[PDB]
Structures are given as structure tokens and as C-alpha cells.
Scaffold this active site. Sequence first.
Site, PDB file in Angstrom:
ATOM      1  N   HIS A 146      -6.881 -25.170  12.488  1.00 55.88           N
ATOM      2  CA  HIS A 146      -6.613 -26.271  11.868  1.00 55.88           C
ATOM      3  C   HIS A 146      -4.943 -26.475  11.536  1.00 55.88           C
ATOM      4  O   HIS A 146      -4.665 -27.434  11.356  1.00 55.88           O
ATOM      5  CB  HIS A 146      -7.239 -26.123  10.169  1.00 55.88           C
ATOM      6  CG  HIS A 146      -8.607 -26.203  10.070  1.00 55.88           C
ATOM      7  ND1 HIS A 146      -9.005 -27.623  10.455  1.00 55.88           N
ATOM      8  CD2 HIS A 146      -9.643 -25.983   9.234  1.00 55.88           C
ATOM      9  CE1 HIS A 146     -10.624 -27.710   9.839  1.00 55.88           C
ATOM     10  NE2 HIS A 146     -10.910 -26.512   9.392  1.00 55.88           N
ATOM     11  N   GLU A 204     -22.515 -19.839  17.730  1.00 54.05           N
ATOM     12  CA  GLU A 204     -22.663 -20.078  16.129  1.00 54.05           C
ATOM     13  C   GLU A 204     -21.577 -19.926  15.030  1.00 54.05           C
ATOM     14  O   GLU A 204     -20.770 -19.077  15.395  1.00 54.05           O
ATOM     15  CB  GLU A 204     -23.717 -19.037  15.634  1.00 54.05           C
ATOM     16  CG  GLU A 204     -25.068 -18.739  16.310  1.00 54.05           C
ATOM     17  CD  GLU A 204     -26.112 -19.734  15.868  1.00 54.05           C
ATOM     18  OE1 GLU A 204     -26.113 -20.811  16.343  1.00 54.05           O
ATOM     19  OE2 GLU A 204     -26.372 -19.822  14.502  1.00 54.05           O
ATOM     20  N   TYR A 220     -22.021 -14.884   6.365  1.00 50.97           N
ATOM     21  CA  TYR A 220     -23.046 -15.676   5.745  1.00 50.97           C
ATOM     22  C   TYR A 220     -24.367 -14.987   5.140  1.00 50.97           C
ATOM     23  O   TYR A 220     -24.763 -14.366   6.131  1.00 50.97           O
ATOM     24  CB  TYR A 220     -23.493 -16.919   6.634  1.00 50.97           C
ATOM     25  CG  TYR A 220     -24.095 -18.087   6.017  1.00 50.97           C
ATOM     26  CD1 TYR A 220     -23.755 -18.518   4.974  1.00 50.97           C
ATOM     27  CD2 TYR A 220     -25.402 -18.450   6.557  1.00 50.97           C
ATOM     28  CE1 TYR A 220     -24.447 -20.017   4.159  1.00 50.97           C
ATOM     29  CE2 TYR A 220     -26.265 -19.562   6.059  1.00 50.97           C
ATOM     30  CZ  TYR A 220     -25.413 -20.291   4.890  1.00 50.97           C
ATOM     31  OH  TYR A 220     -26.233 -21.309   4.508  1.00 50.97           O
ATOM     32  N   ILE A 228     -30.467 -12.434   4.601  1.00 47.28           N
ATOM     33  CA  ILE A 228     -31.182 -13.040   5.568  1.00 47.28           C
ATOM     34  C   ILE A 228     -30.297 -12.828   6.919  1.00 47.28           C
ATOM     35  O   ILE A 228     -29.248 -12.259   7.282  1.00 47.28           O
ATOM     36  CB  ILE A 228     -31.173 -14.876   5.632  1.00 47.28           C
ATOM     37  CG1 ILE A 228     -31.254 -15.262   4.335  1.00 47.28           C
ATOM     38  CG2 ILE A 228     -32.630 -15.099   6.465  1.00 47.28           C
ATOM     39  CD1 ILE A 228     -31.734 -14.318   3.188  1.00 47.28           C
ATOM     40  N   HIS A 250     -11.035 -20.383  13.288  1.00 45.48           N
ATOM     41  CA  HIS A 250     -11.404 -21.793  12.841  1.00 45.48           C
ATOM     42  C   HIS A 250     -10.326 -22.596  11.805  1.00 45.48           C
ATOM     43  O   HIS A 250      -9.896 -23.606  12.157  1.00 45.48           O
ATOM     44  CB  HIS A 250     -12.915 -22.005  12.299  1.00 45.48           C
ATOM     45  CG  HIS A 250     -13.156 -23.389  11.641  1.00 45.48           C
ATOM     46  ND1 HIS A 250     -14.217 -23.900  11.838  1.00 45.48           N
ATOM     47  CD2 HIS A 250     -12.507 -23.971  10.618  1.00 45.48           C
ATOM     48  CE1 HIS A 250     -14.223 -25.055  11.013  1.00 45.48           C
ATOM     49  NE2 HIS A 250     -13.090 -25.051  10.339  1.00 45.48           N
ATOM     50  N   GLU A 251      -9.817 -21.647  11.049  1.00 48.35           N
ATOM     51  CA  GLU A 251      -8.782 -21.690   9.998  1.00 48.35           C
ATOM     52  C   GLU A 251      -7.492 -22.086  10.455  1.00 48.35           C
ATOM     53  O   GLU A 251      -6.447 -22.856  10.182  1.00 48.35           O
ATOM     54  CB  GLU A 251      -8.840 -20.737   8.881  1.00 48.35           C
ATOM     55  CG  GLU A 251     -10.092 -20.795   8.030  1.00 48.35           C
ATOM     56  CD  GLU A 251     -10.460 -22.260   7.686  1.00 48.35           C
ATOM     57  OE1 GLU A 251     -10.008 -23.425   7.479  1.00 48.35           O
ATOM     58  OE2 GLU A 251     -11.695 -21.873   7.174  1.00 48.35           O
ATOM     59  N   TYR A 295      -8.137 -35.845   7.888  1.00 46.37           N
ATOM     60  CA  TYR A 295      -9.400 -35.294   7.581  1.00 46.37           C
ATOM     61  C   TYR A 295     -10.515 -35.972   6.943  1.00 46.37           C
ATOM     62  O   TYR A 295     -10.945 -35.728   6.039  1.00 46.37           O
ATOM     63  CB  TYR A 295      -8.991 -34.323   6.416  1.00 46.37           C
ATOM     64  CG  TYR A 295     -10.123 -33.006   6.641  1.00 46.37           C
ATOM     65  CD1 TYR A 295     -11.021 -32.535   5.531  1.00 46.37           C
ATOM     66  CD2 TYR A 295     -10.381 -32.272   7.816  1.00 46.37           C
ATOM     67  CE1 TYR A 295     -11.654 -31.393   5.683  1.00 46.37           C
ATOM     68  CE2 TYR A 295     -11.313 -31.212   7.977  1.00 46.37           C
ATOM     69  CZ  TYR A 295     -11.779 -30.773   6.685  1.00 46.37           C
ATOM     70  OH  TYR A 295     -12.723 -29.544   6.855  1.00 46.37           O
ATOM     71  N   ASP A 341       0.820  -1.258  -0.103  1.00 50.07           N
ATOM     72  CA  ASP A 341      -0.035   0.088   0.032  1.00 50.07           C
ATOM     73  C   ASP A 341       0.956   1.128   0.029  1.00 50.07           C
ATOM     74  O   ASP A 341       1.922   1.186   0.510  1.00 50.07           O
ATOM     75  CB  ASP A 341      -0.922  -0.113   1.242  1.00 50.07           C
ATOM     76  CG  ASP A 341      -1.932   1.138   1.311  1.00 50.07           C
ATOM     77  OD1 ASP A 341      -3.095   0.853   0.543  1.00 50.07           O
ATOM     78  OD2 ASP A 341      -1.595   1.835   1.597  1.00 50.07           O
ATOM     79  N   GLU A 372     -12.760 -30.889  12.799  1.00 49.64           N
ATOM     80  CA  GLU A 372     -13.538 -29.588  12.271  1.00 49.64           C
ATOM     81  C   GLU A 372     -14.440 -29.123  13.513  1.00 49.64           C
ATOM     82  O   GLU A 372     -14.545 -28.005  13.673  1.00 49.64           O
ATOM     83  CB  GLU A 372     -14.833 -29.982  11.315  1.00 49.64           C
ATOM     84  CG  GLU A 372     -14.490 -30.248   9.989  1.00 49.64           C
ATOM     85  CD  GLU A 372     -14.195 -28.886   9.609  1.00 49.64           C
ATOM     86  OE1 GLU A 372     -13.262 -28.565   9.073  1.00 49.64           O
ATOM     87  OE2 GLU A 372     -14.950 -27.994   9.898  1.00 49.64           O
ATOM     88  N   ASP A 425     -18.892 -35.070   1.611  1.00 48.05           N
ATOM     89  CA  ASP A 425     -17.943 -34.380   2.483  1.00 48.05           C
ATOM     90  C   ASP A 425     -16.777 -35.054   3.550  1.00 48.05           C
ATOM     91  O   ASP A 425     -16.776 -34.736   4.837  1.00 48.05           O
ATOM     92  CB  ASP A 425     -18.967 -33.565   3.840  1.00 48.05           C
ATOM     93  CG  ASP A 425     -18.558 -32.904   4.560  1.00 48.05           C
ATOM     94  OD1 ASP A 425     -17.549 -31.708   4.306  1.00 48.05           O
ATOM     95  OD2 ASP A 425     -19.048 -32.540   5.600  1.00 48.05           O
ATOM     96  N   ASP A 460     -29.395 -15.972  10.715  1.00 45.96           N
ATOM     97  CA  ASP A 460     -29.067 -17.370  10.253  1.00 45.96           C
ATOM     98  C   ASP A 460     -27.419 -17.603  10.399  1.00 45.96           C
ATOM     99  O   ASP A 460     -26.826 -16.456  10.845  1.00 45.96           O
ATOM    100  CB  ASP A 460     -29.749 -17.655   8.943  1.00 45.96           C
ATOM    101  CG  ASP A 460     -28.997 -16.778   7.866  1.00 45.96           C
ATOM    102  OD1 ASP A 460     -28.214 -15.865   8.008  1.00 45.96           O
ATOM    103  OD2 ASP A 460     -29.223 -17.429   6.822  1.00 45.96           O
ATOM    104  N   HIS A 499     -18.150 -32.135   8.286  1.00 45.02           N
ATOM    105  CA  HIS A 499     -18.828 -30.960   8.582  1.00 45.02           C
ATOM    106  C   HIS A 499     -20.307 -31.100   8.775  1.00 45.02           C
ATOM    107  O   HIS A 499     -20.815 -30.070   9.284  1.00 45.02           O
ATOM    108  CB  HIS A 499     -18.793 -29.743   7.559  1.00 45.02           C
ATOM    109  CG  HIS A 499     -17.530 -29.298   6.804  1.00 45.02           C
ATOM    110  ND1 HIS A 499     -17.032 -30.038   5.857  1.00 45.02           N
ATOM    111  CD2 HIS A 499     -16.687 -28.187   7.291  1.00 45.02           C
ATOM    112  CE1 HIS A 499     -15.986 -29.450   5.565  1.00 45.02           C
ATOM    113  NE2 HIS A 499     -15.717 -28.416   6.266  1.00 45.02           N
TER     114      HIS A 499
HETATM  115 CA   LIG Z   1      -3.745   3.001   0.749  1.00 51.96          CA
HETATM  116 CA   LIG Z   2     -27.111 -14.022   7.206  1.00 57.25          CA
HETATM  117 CA   LIG Z   3     -20.102 -16.986  16.097  1.00 57.57          CA
HETATM  118 ZN   LIG Z   4     -12.637 -26.437   8.648  1.00 53.68          ZN
END
Ligand SMILES: [Ca+2]
Ligand SMILES: [Ca+2]
Ligand SMILES: [Ca+2]
Ligand SMILES: [Zn+2]
Length: 316
Positions: free
Chosen positions: A146, A187, A193, A197, A142-143, A157, A57, A166, A226, A200, A231
Site C-alpha cells: 500500500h 489465499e 483469521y 475454523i 499487503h500493508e 482509494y 526490552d 487492494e 466499502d 478458511d 475489497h
Molecule cells: Ca525481554
Molecule cells: Ca481459520
Molecule cells: Ca496466504
Molecule cells: Zn488493503
Amino acid sequence: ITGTSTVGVGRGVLGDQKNINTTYSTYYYLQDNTRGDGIFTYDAKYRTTLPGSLWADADNQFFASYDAPAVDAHYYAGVTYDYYKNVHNRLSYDGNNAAIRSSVHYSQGYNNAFWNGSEMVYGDGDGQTFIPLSGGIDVVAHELTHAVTDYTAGLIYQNESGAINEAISDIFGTLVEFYANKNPDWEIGEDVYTPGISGDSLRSMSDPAKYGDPDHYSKRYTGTQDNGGVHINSGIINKAAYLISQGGTHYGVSVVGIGRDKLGKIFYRALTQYLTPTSNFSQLRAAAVQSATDLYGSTSQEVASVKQAFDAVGVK
Ligand SMILES: [Ca+2]
Ligand SMILES: [Ca+2]
Ligand SMILES: [Ca+2]
Ligand SMILES: [Zn+2]
Ligand SMILES: [Ca+2]
């Protein structure tokens, strides 16, 4: 890169402003030197070629919309590294301060994020099912978790060892979210997501069934998609994890909750001291009971509630 450590400001995926650690060498780089061997954020520029380019940047201000995912990916990696270090005492995911590398804008309208064995990858979503995935801090921890699993239990896996893999990442992704006090819940992915909506989320820990996930061993998915439902069966472990912490009556089985500080620590120990690459759900239970007993004693309340919760989910 070699350069001076500084601080810049950017706006995240949700339009939230923040400061991020950067490095100055003619350009301002998304390179944080304050955590371990550092956190590096790359621009995959809509290709599938990784890592892609270290983010550059010219003014240290990351307010362009193209910038939003790099900002959040970078930052959220930074508090995840901090949770690990401050709460379980682990330095980085390997326990040795290894560099954290993340790539944003990967592919075109990629609905997902992953750990590939050496870096984290985040797509931008189609703009309807998901918005840029680095925008959810539970997605980002979460990533990283792993990474952490890969370097500790190494759970393969697929099948039950992969559903446990997972659920760990969803358990610490949710602990990291409470850790930052970023509007926490039980959640997963709710922030990134279905932008249209409300209320959810990808998956629910409190009620995996909401969205159809088994919340009992007798509901376990046995086919093939899966990776044997990695999952999907993960909900059985999320429910269990949810009951231990909060408490409750599931299927007529009552659990007194011991709280999340203790849930995090009996889990991090099971994961780092007793889980193996081939561990199944019955082994996870032994392992969690054994860690709870290690830390609180054989006759503790903590020991009793992990028993109750695996009993309520039908594990063993
Ligand atoms: Ca910039
Ligand atoms: Ca949503
Ligand atoms: Ca959450
Ligand atoms: Zn995962
Ligand atoms: Ca939340």
C-alpha cells in the site's frame, strides 16, 4: 535511536521462534539498522495514539506473549523489504530507503491492520475473528505494498482504482509469502483469521467466489459500502492475476500460465511505469499488456496469457 546493532530472539504469533535485528542503548530496541534507513516497531499500548513508544526490552529476548506481534511485525517487514529490493530492485517503499515504522497493540480487540499514509498499524483482533494481525506475512506485505502504491501509481482509494489498489497489495502480499516459502497459497489472511475454523481465510485468489467475491466483471459490485467495494471487486483482478501465473479455464476461457516470477514482474512494471491515480480495470489491462509486451515482446506467450486472463474475467 543511536546505539549498537545486535540480534535478539522472540517467539511470533504462531509460537515460532526467530531472530530479529535490534539496537542496544541501555535497553534493547526493536530498531533494525541493516535495512535502509531502518525498521522501527512501536508499542501503541492499546490506545489509538500513534506511533506510540519505540519498542524497549531489557534483555533482547522477546518471548512474552505481549511481545509476539511486535516480533512478527518487525521481522515480516524485514523480509518484505528484502523481497522488494532483491526481486524488483526497490529500496524501501519510496525507492529511497525510507524508514519502515509499524505500531502493534493498537486499540482493544481491533480486527484489522492498515497503512495510514505514513506507517503501518496492527490490531490484536477480538481473539475469535482474528488473532494479532502481524502474524500473517501476506497481511504484513499487503500493508507495505500500500506504501509502495502510494509512492508509485497512487491509486485513489475508492471505486475501481481502489479495488486495483487492494488487488496489488494482495498480489504482492501473496508473492512475498511464496518468496519466504512460508507455506504459500493464493489465499489472504488464512494464518490470522478465525482461530477456531480451519481451512478458511479472508479472501481467496484462486476462487474469489468461495467467500462471495465477484470472479467476473459482470459480477462487479456497484453500490456504496466499502468505498464502492474496494475489497469486493478486488477479486476480479486477483482471479486474473491467479490465471496468468497458474493457468486454467475460467468461464470457458483457457489461460496457459506463465508462472509467478513473471506475474510479479509484469505487475510491478504496470504499477510503477503505467498506472495513474485514476486508472480503472480497462486501463490496468492495457498497462499489463503494455508491460508484458515491454519485457517479453508483442508476440510473446506472456503477452498472450495476460490477454486471455483479462478476457476470462470479463475485463474488456
Ligand atoms: Ca525481554
Ligand atoms: Ca481459520
Ligand atoms: Ca496466504
Ligand atoms: Zn488493503
Ligand atoms: Ca499461507
